[PDB]
Design an enzyme around this catalytic site. Structure first.
Site, PDB file in Angstrom:
ATOM      1  N   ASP B 349       0.874  -0.733  -0.275  1.00  0.00           N
ATOM      2  CA  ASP B 349       0.383  -0.299   0.047  1.00  0.00           C
ATOM      3  C   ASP B 349       0.825   1.384   0.091  1.00  0.00           C
ATOM      4  O   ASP B 349       2.289   0.950   0.612  1.00  0.00           O
ATOM      5  CB  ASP B 349      -0.591   0.270   1.124  1.00  0.00           C
ATOM      6  CG  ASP B 349      -2.132   1.259   1.603  1.00  0.00           C
ATOM      7  OD1 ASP B 349      -1.975   1.718  -0.224  1.00  0.00           O
ATOM      8  OD2 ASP B 349      -1.257   1.972   2.253  1.00  0.00           O
ATOM      9  N   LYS B 460      -7.207  35.704  -4.603  1.00  0.00           N
ATOM     10  CA  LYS B 460      -6.575  34.996  -3.493  1.00  0.00           C
ATOM     11  C   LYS B 460      -4.674  35.110  -3.844  1.00  0.00           C
ATOM     12  O   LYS B 460      -4.233  35.148  -3.999  1.00  0.00           O
ATOM     13  CB  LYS B 460      -5.994  32.795  -4.485  1.00  0.00           C
ATOM     14  CG  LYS B 460      -5.612  31.912  -4.245  1.00  0.00           C
ATOM     15  CD  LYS B 460      -5.911  30.818  -4.214  1.00  0.00           C
ATOM     16  CE  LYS B 460      -5.124  29.450  -3.445  1.00  0.00           C
ATOM     17  NZ  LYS B 460      -3.921  29.653  -2.554  1.00  0.00           N
ATOM     18  N   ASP B 690      -1.938  -0.319   6.101  1.00  0.00           N
ATOM     19  CA  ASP B 690      -2.543   0.036   6.782  1.00  0.00           C
ATOM     20  C   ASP B 690      -4.442   0.647   7.264  1.00  0.00           C
ATOM     21  O   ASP B 690      -4.279   0.540   8.424  1.00  0.00           O
ATOM     22  CB  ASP B 690      -1.463   1.433   7.356  1.00  0.00           C
ATOM     23  CG  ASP B 690      -1.690   2.728   6.256  1.00  0.00           C
ATOM     24  OD1 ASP B 690      -1.692   2.527   4.571  1.00  0.00           O
ATOM     25  OD2 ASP B 690      -2.275   3.485   6.348  1.00  0.00           O
ATOM     26  N   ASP B 694      -6.852  -2.059   2.926  1.00  0.00           N
ATOM     27  CA  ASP B 694      -6.012  -2.799   2.979  1.00  0.00           C
ATOM     28  C   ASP B 694      -7.106  -3.971   3.498  1.00  0.00           C
ATOM     29  O   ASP B 694      -6.431  -4.962   3.932  1.00  0.00           O
ATOM     30  CB  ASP B 694      -4.735  -2.234   3.330  1.00  0.00           C
ATOM     31  CG  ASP B 694      -4.493  -1.260   2.770  1.00  0.00           C
ATOM     32  OD1 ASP B 694      -4.463  -1.674   1.306  1.00  0.00           O
ATOM     33  OD2 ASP B 694      -3.913  -0.407   3.248  1.00  0.00           O
TER      34      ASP B 694
HETATM   35 MG   LIG Z   1      -2.980   3.455   3.727  1.00  0.00          MG
END
Ligand SMILES: [Mg+2]
Ligand SMILES: *[C@@H]1O[C@H](CO)[C@@H](O[C@@H]2O[C@H](CO)[C@@H](O)[C@H](O)[C@H]2NC(C)=O)[C@H](O)[C@H]1NC(C)=O
Ligand SMILES: CC(C)CCC[C@@H](C)[C@H]1CC[C@H]2[C@@H]3CC=C4C[C@@H](O)CC[C@]4(C)[C@H]3CC[C@]12C
Ligand SMILES: CC(C)CCC[C@@H](C)[C@H]1CC[C@H]2[C@@H]3CC=C4C[C@@H](O)CC[C@]4(C)[C@H]3CC[C@]12C
Ligand SMILES: *[C@@H]1O[C@H](CO)[C@@H](O)[C@H](O)[C@H]1NC(C)=O
Ligand SMILES: [Mg+2]
Ligand SMILES: [Mg+2]
EC number: 7.2.2.13
Lengths: 291, 996, 32
Positions: B349, B460, B690, B694
């Site tokens: 990941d 901006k 994490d 996942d």
């Molecule tokens: Mg992750």
């Protein structure tokens, strides 16, 4: 899943032909070398021990006491009438005493007439082979009175009131030493103490001792024991066809139709006992003459 | 029909976000400004269920105890004990006063299984206990607007369709539908995987309910700003709720190590039943009866089952697992410790696992020179250059023109891992000044601020005017920051090497290319500038304006640029390199935008230099991408939008013809699809994640690796290995330990399988040649459950014979744990020599006591008889029952000692597979203790007072200990020359037959 | 007599050997 039978690569049972030959050849050479090595080591081991003496004799320190009827459970149960009921016993007695007949001991080059009286130990030099083949003292069946073999009465020992002879476990170099002064068990059964190993039978508890009526012992010259003139033993190599002493025991006034226990204890200084081995030193029998 | 429910949860989600503010309030029936009446809450709270995920399923205490009591190895032992009892039943109805050999063996095998189950349960329970001591989550209540009044109530008291107001800092309670926001940037890290904080806008933006900004998700923290919204989904009906329930409903599968244990049991039974059937036919062909032949068959099969191998394998795995626990590489599955060693494809990941998930200052532009700031988590990188006066200007602009600072308890915590209130960019600037320019606490107040202008939607600009420091007297400092292209236009002066210079296009374009360089690098750039207001034309005291802007918006002095991105973890690049060194294919599976994923992949090693994608070649040739051949591109970026319209066959083509693959914008369900695609090839996969996205990937995979702190709880529970320290290098340590324990397992197994030959052979020839029993059963138990326990365990502490991290991953269909070569060595060669050594001692003892080896043939008949007390030896002596039986037991004990003697050499030779004992060295202190304890225990088992009465193991005449010495020396010499020929001749035969 | 083995001496020597071989192994494993 078990079709490992064949393959296109000429496979049998799992591998090819040349593979089977290579592996089988290796295993033949390998196992042959292993067998040759084991044999060579066992040969050197055979060279370690001698021919006239075992390198260890401490495992037979207290000699045993066997009988003639090697019963299935040291029990003698038969019928005083039926001859086939005690055939298994009589046959075992005849084959045992078959090597004690006067015709079996006829050569004078290997037999020595000891004597009609128990005498001192007869030591025939050392155990080496410097001397010729040792002599063996004769032991005629006539010594076992009324429990003799085939002389006048091949009684089969059972027309009621059986016979049970006892034998001391033949041990090489064993010199039996009978007891002396400290006697809390040596009964006055027979006078001869110095040149005979005594053996006395009895019941086992307050019941057997009463059920067993009378016991009559028969030995060399009438002594209930083993004569010292037949010891020590010089091995099967130096003393082939040797005949260890025998001593018969007859139980006359028994209680028919009743299983009673008898303990034949051999007494002596060189005779040890054991609560784990009922045969080392002592001896047991379960007799029952059921009519 | 659960097979369809699982697929419904696998299907991508859909929503009703694209609805007018009048339509949304119509579907649920809720006021847009007052929410709903309090009575209306109990109408939805006790209707569908409180706003909380249904807890996971509970598997009670005794279930794991019974799980370990059955297993597969314990199953082989259970069938062995059952066969023991069946053999005893066949022997009881037949012999006069039987023996208690089979009964003792059966109860022993049962106790072995129970003891192993208890030890295994203790280890697996300790793992879950420490995980429970690490998973302490506290409730987080929601700010709900009910009856027009604000009220803070527990998250579980929230229902579907009631106005919820999320403040900057609060976690999004349930899935909301944004209706009014003010610059809210929710953190969709744990759910979608978007690293950079995504802003939430009430207006519908994207068709995908995830990429859209009008939806707040469960388990997401509001980084900054505030927002309002109507609850759409609650409890398990939420996005992450459905992802978590899908993770709980997935199959774990068969681990690679359990398959090896099974294949091992398979060959064990192969030899067991083969020898039992062949010896059954032989036994009958000789002179035995069917009654005794069945007893034999059962005894041969049972005696061929390694009893003590269960405890040794269990402790063997436990030791390696404890070494992982010492380094925080906890494993919940006792057998998952090896899984890494067989992995050949790691699907990782990006956000959270590879990266730190923390917007950090990466590069800065000052004096026409890019400066890369250290992007490490522990501050162990090369330090940037700071000697010029321009660095001070950039540091001032960043440290001063920034809304907030740290929080209350953020005092003892490190500068990086400490909390900061505000936008993700401001926090990065703060950490860079706190690590590179001292502090910002006293630096911000030392320059008193007067009028600050915050970010605006029109024109901006983000600026602020402050008072001047230490005597230089320029009196004022106007700092401003923003988009590089916008700040460059409102600037005329440029700081360089310390002085000022005009805005000549020569260096202005040098700034432009520096902007595109940091942009293409995968970062977010920001321009910083300041201006000294001349105190002679504009007052020194009070002179400012805010409605009709007075401060000169233009003519400012540009200082430099400051880029930032979430950097990869410290050991991640080296870890990926090590994994690629061992032959593991690294595949990135993320949900972040491809622009960032490609850069991170090239920075960690997933994409090396030189390899171009299908897009890079087309850009290098100024041609359309549809022209280039996909075979010319080694690496490729797979967009998640295109993965949705892919089949099962195409995914295989993507994985086969491409080495470096990066899956971007992939939903959690798509991650599961990718994992299944990698498993279809037949290779071992390991997923490291994490977030909750996942969980379905870490559950289905052969082994899931979750982060101890940076990983969500769902994916932390659905995984099989936890990294308490989050050190991604633990993956490299895990694969090393896996292959190491695999080899040591082969060695320990061979050591236990070699002892069965001199164990069974005495009983075999005892039946065959009718000789007195050379080896009893008590002694055998003292061998497999006594002496050989420590050597088999110490064989697990062995270390690499070569570079294990250099060889390729093992093939599940080719490189088996226990192959035919191990059987040919243990049962074929070594065990045979041990058996011959045992028989040598047997004949030695019996022959020295008067019973010559030749005279022992056919003596068993009258030897086992309890009433023939005139057994004649080779010398003519008459032996009683107990006398010759004492010799038999004092002949069994030295046979056991003989086994120990040959086991010395067997342990030394099984200690190494290829190298020589001298090349490897006996540096295994545990292995040396294994020999000393083994010998001492054996000597004790024979010379202890009362052994001939308790275990019938009589003392040995000292000269017996040297009976097996030549055989052991022979075993050592033979196997040594064998491994030497394998070393010098790594050709055929000596490698295809012996090598196990 | 040759029918007597000093089993006590050999048994004591075996116990002594076991003790020494065990403490030595402990020293090797608990090395410092
Ligand atoms: Mg992750
Ligand atoms: C040897 O055999 C004779 C048989 O001819 C035994 O004769 C016994 O004589 C005594 C004395 O009157 C009787 O009490 C017994 O009942 C007789 N026994 C039998 C079996 O008839 C004689 O006892 C035997 N033993 C000896 C030592 O002479
Ligand atoms: C080819 C060469 C090196 C092999 C020679 C074989 C030697 C090493 C073998 C052959 C016979 C063996 C001896 C045979 C007899 C005895 C006595 C016995 O109670 C204990 C073992 C012991 C002491 C052996 C020691 C090793 C020995 C001497
Ligand atoms: C690395 C290798 C060669 C070391 C071999 C160790 C040898 C020297 C040791 C290991 C165990 C030892 C035996 C252990 C037990 C006994 C019985 C005891 O009552 C007297 C000593 C005696 C007979 C020992 C003789 C020497 C011996 C065989
Ligand atoms: C057995 O016979 C003997 C013969 O002398 C006799 O004295 C004894 O009392 C008898 N005992 C029993 C128990 O019959
Ligand atoms: Mg075994
Ligand atoms: Mg798993």
């Amino acid at each position: 899943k078990k079709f490992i039978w064949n393959s296109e690569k000429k496979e049998f049972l799992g591998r090819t032909g040349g593979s089977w030959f290579k592996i089988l050849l290796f295993y033949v050479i390998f196992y042959g070398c292993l067998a040759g090595i084991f044999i060579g080591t066992i040969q050197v081991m055979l060279l370690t021990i001698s021919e006239f003496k075992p390198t260890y004799q401490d495992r037979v320190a207290p000699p045993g006491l066997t009988q003639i009827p090697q019963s299935q459970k040291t029990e003698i149960s038969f019928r005083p009438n039926d001859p086939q009921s005690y055939e298994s016993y009589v046959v075992s007695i005849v084959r045992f005493l078959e090597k004690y007949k006067d015709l079996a001991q006829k050569d004078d080059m290997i037999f020595e007439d000891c004597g009609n009286v128990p005498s001192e130990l007869k030591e025939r030099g050392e155990y080496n082979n410097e001397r010729g083949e040792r002599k063996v003292c004769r032991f005629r069946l006539e010594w076992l009175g009324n429990c003799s073999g085939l002389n006048d009465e091949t009684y089969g020992y059972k027309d009621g009131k059986p016979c049970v002879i006892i034998k001391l476990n033949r041990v090489l170099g064993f010199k039996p030493k009978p007891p002396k002064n400290e006697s809390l068990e040596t009964y006055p059964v027979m006078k001869y103490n110095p040149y005979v190993l005594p053996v006395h039978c009895t019941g086992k508890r307050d019941e057997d001792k009463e059920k067993v009526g009378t016991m009559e012992y028969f030995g060399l010259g009438g002594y209930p024991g083993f004569p010292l003139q037949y010891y020590p033993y010089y091995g099967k190599l130096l003393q082939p066809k040797y005949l260890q002493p025998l001593m018969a025991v007859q139980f006359t006034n028994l209680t028919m139709d009743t299983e009673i226990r008898i303990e034949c204890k051999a007494y002596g200084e060189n005779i040890g006992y054991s609560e784990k081995d009922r045969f080392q030193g002592r001896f047991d029998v379960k007799i029952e003459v059921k009519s | 029909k659960e097979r369809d429910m699982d697929e419904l949860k696998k299907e991508v989600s859909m929503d009703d976000h694209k609805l007018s503010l009048d339509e949304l309030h119509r579907k649920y029936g809720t006021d847009l400004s007052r929410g709903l009446t309090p009575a209306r809450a109990a109408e939805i709270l006790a209707r569908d269920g409180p706003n909380a995920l249904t807890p996971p399923p509970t598997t009670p205490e005794w279930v794991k105890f019974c799980r370990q009591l059955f297993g597969g190895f314990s199953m082989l032992l259970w069938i062995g004990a059952i066969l023991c009892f069946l053999a005893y039943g066949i022997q009881a109805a037949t012999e006069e006063e039987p023996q208690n050999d089979n009964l003792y063996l059966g109860v022993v095998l049962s106790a072995v299984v129970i003891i192993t189950g208890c030890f295994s349960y203790y280890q697996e329970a300790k793992s879950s206990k420490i995980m429970e001591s690490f998973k302490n989550m506290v409730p987080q209540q929601a700010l709900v607007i009910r009856n027009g009044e604000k009220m803070s109530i527990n998250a579980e008291e929230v229902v579907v369709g009631d106005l919820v107001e999320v403040k900057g800092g609060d976690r999004i309670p349930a899935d909301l539908r944004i209706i009014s926001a003010n610059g809210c940037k929710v953190d969709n890290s744990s759910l979608t995987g978007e690293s950079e904080p995504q802003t939430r806008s009430p207006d519908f933006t994207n068709e995908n309910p995830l990429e859209t900004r009008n939806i707040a998700f469960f388990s997401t923290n509001c980084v900054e700003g505030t927002a309002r919204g109507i609850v759409v989904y609650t409890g398990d009906r939420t996005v992450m709720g459905r992802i978590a329930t899908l993770a709980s409903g997935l199959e774990g599968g068969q681990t690679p190590i359990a398959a090896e244990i099974e294949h091992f049991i398979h060959i064990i039974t192969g030899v067991a039943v083969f020898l039992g059937v062949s010896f059954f036919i032989l036994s009958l062909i000789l002179e035995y009866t069917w009654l005794e032949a069945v007893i034999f068959l059962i005894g041969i099969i049972v005696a061929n089952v390694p009893e003590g191998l269960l405890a040794t394998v269990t402790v063997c795995l436990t030791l390696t697992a404890k070494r992982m626990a010492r380094k925080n590489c906890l494993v919940k599955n006792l057998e998952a410790v090896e899984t890494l060693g067989s992995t050949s494809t790691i699907c990782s990941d990006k956000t959270g696992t590879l990266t730190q998930n923390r917007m950090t200052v990466a590069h800065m532009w000052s004096d026409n020179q890019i400066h890369e700031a250290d992007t490490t988590e522990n501050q162990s990188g090369v330090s940037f250059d700071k000697t010029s006066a321009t660095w001070l200007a950039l540091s001032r602009i960043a440290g001063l023109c920034n809304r907030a600072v740290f929080q209350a308890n953020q005092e003892n915590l490190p500068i990086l891992k400490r909390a900061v209130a505000g936008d993700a960019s401001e926090s990065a600037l703060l950490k860079c000044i706190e690590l590179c320019c001292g502090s910002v606490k006293e630096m911000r107040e030392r320059y008193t601020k007067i009028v600050e202008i915050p970010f605006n939607s029109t024109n901006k600009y983000q600026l602020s005017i402050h008072k001047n420091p230490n005597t230089a007297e320029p009196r004022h400092l106007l700092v401003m920051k923003g988009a590089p292209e916008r700040i460059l236009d409102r600037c005329s002066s440029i700081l360089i090497h310390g002085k000022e210079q005009p805005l000549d296009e020569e260096l202005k374009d040098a700034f432009q290319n520096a902007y595109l360089e940091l942009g293409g690098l995968g970062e977010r750039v920001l321009g910083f500038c300041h201006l000294f207001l001349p105190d002679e034309q504009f007052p020194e005291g009070f002179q400012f304006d805010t409605d009709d802007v007075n401060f000169p918006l233009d003519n400012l002095c540009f200082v430099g640029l400051i880029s930032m991105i979430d950097p990869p973890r410290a050991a991640v690049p080296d870890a990926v390199g090590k994994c690629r060194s061992a032959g593991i294919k690294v595949i990135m599976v993320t949900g972040d935008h491809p622009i960032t994923a490609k850069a991170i992949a090239k920075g960690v090693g997933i994409i090396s230099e030189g390899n171009e994608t299908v897009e890079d070649i087309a850009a290098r040739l100024n041609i359309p991408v549809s022209q280039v051949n996909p075979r010319d591109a080694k690496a490729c970026v797979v967009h998640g939008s295109d993965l949705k319209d892919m089949t099962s066959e195409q995914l295989d083509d993507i994985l086969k013809y491409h080495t470096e693959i990066v899956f971007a914008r992939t939903s959690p369900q798509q991650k599961l699809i990718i994992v299944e695609g990698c498993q279809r090839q037949g290779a071992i996969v390991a997923v490291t994640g994490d977030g909750v996205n996942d969980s379905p990937a870490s559950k289905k995979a052969d082994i899931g690796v979750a982060m101890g702190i940076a990983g969500s709880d769902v994916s932390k529970q659905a995984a099989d290995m936890i990294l308490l320290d989050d050190n991604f290098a633990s993956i490299v340590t895990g694969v090393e330990e896996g292959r190491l324990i695999f080899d040591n397992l082969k060695k320990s197994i061979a050591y236990t399988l070699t002892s069965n030959i001199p164990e069974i052979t005495p009983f075999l020839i005892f039946i065959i040649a009718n000789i007195p029993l050379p080896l009893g059963t008590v002694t055998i138990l003292c061998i497999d459950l006594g002496t050989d326990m420590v050597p088999a365990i110490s064989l697990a502490y062995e270390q690499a014979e070569s570079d294990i991290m250099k060889r390729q991953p093992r093939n599940p269909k080719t490189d088996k744990l226990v192959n035919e070569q191990l059987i040919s060595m243990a049962y074929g060669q070594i065990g045979m020599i041990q058996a011959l050594g045992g028989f040598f001692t047997y004949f030695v003892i019996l022959a020295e006591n008067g019973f010559l080896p030749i005279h022992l043939l056919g003596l068993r008949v009258n030897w086992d008889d309890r009433w023939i007390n005139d057994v004649e030896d080779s010398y003519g002596q008459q032996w009683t029952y107990e006398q010759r039986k004492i010799v038999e037991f004092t002949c069994h004990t030295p046979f056991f000692v003989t086994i120990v003697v040959v086991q010395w050499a067997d342990l030394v030779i099984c200690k190494t597979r290829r190298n020589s004992v001298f090349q490897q060295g006996m540096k295994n202190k545990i292995l040396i203790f294994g020999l000393f304890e083994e010998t001492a225990l054996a000597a004790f088992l024979s010379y202890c007072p009362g052994m001939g009465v308790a275990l019938r193991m009589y003392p040995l005449k000292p000269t017996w200990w040297f009976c097996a010495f030549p055989y052991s020396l022979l075993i050592f010499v033979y196997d040594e020359v064998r491994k030497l020929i394998i070393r010098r001749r790594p050709g055929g035969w000596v490698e295809k037959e012996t090598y196990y | 007599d040759p029918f007597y083995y000093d089993y006590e001496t050999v048994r004591n020597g075996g116990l002594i050997f076991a003790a020494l071989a065990f403490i030595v192994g402990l020293i090797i494993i608990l090395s410092k």
